[model samples]
Target: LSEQLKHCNGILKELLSKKHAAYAWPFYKPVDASALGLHDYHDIIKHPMDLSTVKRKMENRDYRDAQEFAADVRLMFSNCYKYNPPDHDVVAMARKLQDVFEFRYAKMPD
Candidate 1:
């Protein structure tokens, strides 16, 4: 999660520095697991079920904030799924992540 946060921070910083209007869109480079700080929390974490709340928060934000929020939501979902496979009736965590991306990016100004 730390590495994911760092990556998102880097991307946001770069985009903001570039003054790209499209930076408000929800998009991110895929995370490389090897770069993640998984060892730091090994045996100390559980399934990230709290991502749902975070997702709703992301959805509620304006475009720019939503873009950053989407990064966090996506990272939370990825970690949750990595820790535990979804069972029957499990929430569509990944789908929510994609939804945020689509909502923010699909209609973004060119």
Candidate 2:
């Protein structure tokens, strides 16, 4: 279990580092619905999640297993699709990043 946790931490940190580029800008930090003028975001996305929050949770050792960590990662991407327009750049990035994450996450020990 500890080894699995460590692998998850490693994968998470590596994925978090993707925020340096433009496509990942919207996902790097917490979403500010009011500031960004997303009036109905809260209503549409009941459980708002983001990359930084995922990182923080992992660092706090809040995830008991790789599956738990994957759930949050999926949540962030899922929230993006639910809130953003289908063609929006944020949606594109979310899709892109989620694919990247899945690629790395798949290699982790079950």
Candidate 3:
């Protein structure tokens, strides 16, 4: 977990620097979900879901481990919003993805 967190921190730093190094104002705000656009959110969620599926299979059905990875990935995206909110389409897509996640988790058997 320590190693994974370190790696994720590096990635997040790089991503934030690349996107917000020069941009100012609202762009400097860190990964706020409310600031994201639909498309950006969708891409963020979709990428993790895809990777989670592969990781689950590769890890011999370790959904818990897969979910940890997914959560980290999601954090990366959320952090990106601190640098800049998604445009209109991106925000819309993000909201849709959020809805999907909400619905899926709400229905999962405990």
Each model's number of backbone clashes?
A: 0, 0, 16
Better of 1 and 2 by TM-score: 2
Tens digit of lDDT per residue, candidate 2, span 1-110?
Answer: 38888887877777767453666668778899899898998989999887789888877878888888889889888998877789987788787877778887888876
Candidate 1 off by > 4 Å: 1-67, 86-88, 91-97, 100-104
Give the residue spans of candidate 3 off by over 4 A: 1-70
lDDT string for model 3 (1-110, tens) is: 24443343333343334443333222223333455553555445433323234233334534344356446445533544433467744444444444444444344333
Q: Each model's RMSD to truth, in Å?
A: 13.9, 1.7, 13.6
1-102 per-residue lDDT for model 1 (tens digits): 244333433443443343442432222333323476555344634433233344344345422443465556556555645554576222353454445444
When sorted by lDDT, best at the front, the candidate numbers are 2, 1, 3
Q: Candidate 2: lDDT of 78?
A: 90
Clashes of 1: 0
Candidate 3 local distance difference test against the native: 0.40
RMSD of 3: 13.6
Best by lDDT: 2
Residue-level lDDT for 9 in candidate 1: 38
Better of 1 and 3 by lDDT: 1
